[PDB]
């Protein structure tokens, strides 16, 4: 797999309305995923100096049970882009495995407003892109996405309806975990 080519963070966005809050994934467009569990996902997003620090959620729907994360990342000089280096944690962010050289994840911000935003996440492992992602986030669970964000997916060349939208999958969060 790779992930997409044509991907860069829209200009003029104010990085106040993307650092803020905390993100819940109500749609997400996944390119060729390498399991067949269908995820939820909400996380925290905060910038200081150019240096991004989020701590990250994932749920598993099929499982029922859930994951956590912290990346860490510089922001390019292209805007509200950056690749993240990331640590595993339990749910009390005790650092289980550290952040290598050689695991990350590279995020672009193609639309963000006061309610919404749409974001793209490239994973990787050392040479090979692992994970191409499209997300609709929103600032509380099953909030409508603004019409903004709508008109940005349809300007990404993508159709909302071919997303999976989250909120049927019976997700379960974990806001004590995402605070801070
Ligand atoms: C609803 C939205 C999302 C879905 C469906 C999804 C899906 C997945 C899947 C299937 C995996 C593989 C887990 C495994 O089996 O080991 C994964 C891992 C991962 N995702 Fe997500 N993801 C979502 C959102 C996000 C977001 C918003 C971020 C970062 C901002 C992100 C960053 C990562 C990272 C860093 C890993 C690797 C964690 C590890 O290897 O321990 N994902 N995701």
Redesign the pocket.
């Known amino acids: 797999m790779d992930c997409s080519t044509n991907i860069s963070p829209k200009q003029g966005l104010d990085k106040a309305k993307y650092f803020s809050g905390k993100w819940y994934?109500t749609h997400?467009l996944?390119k060729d995923?390498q399991?067949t569990?269908?995820?939820?996902?909400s996380?925290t997003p905060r910038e200081s100096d150019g240096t991004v620090k989020?701590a990250?959620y994932?749920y598993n729907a099929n499982k029922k049970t859930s994951?956590y994360?912290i990346?860490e990342g510089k922001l390019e000089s292209s805007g509200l882009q950056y690749t993240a280096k990331?640590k595993?944690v339990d749910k009390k962010k005790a650092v289980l495995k550290e952040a290598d050289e050689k695991n990350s994840?590279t995020?672009t911000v193609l639309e963000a407003d006061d309610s919404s935003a749409l974001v793209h996440?490239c994973?990787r492992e050392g040479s090979k892109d692992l994970?191409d992602?499209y997300?609709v986030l929103t600032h509380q669970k099953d909030a409508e996405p603004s019409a903004k964000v709508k008109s940005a997916v349809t300007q990404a060349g993508l159709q909302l309806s071919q997303f999976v939208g989250?909120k049927d999958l019976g997700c379960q969060y974990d806001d004590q975990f995402t605070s801070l």
């Open positions: 994934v997400f996944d995923p399991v569990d269908q995820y939820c996902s996380f989020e990250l994932h994951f994360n990346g990331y595993t994840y995020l996440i994973l994970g992602l997300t989250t």
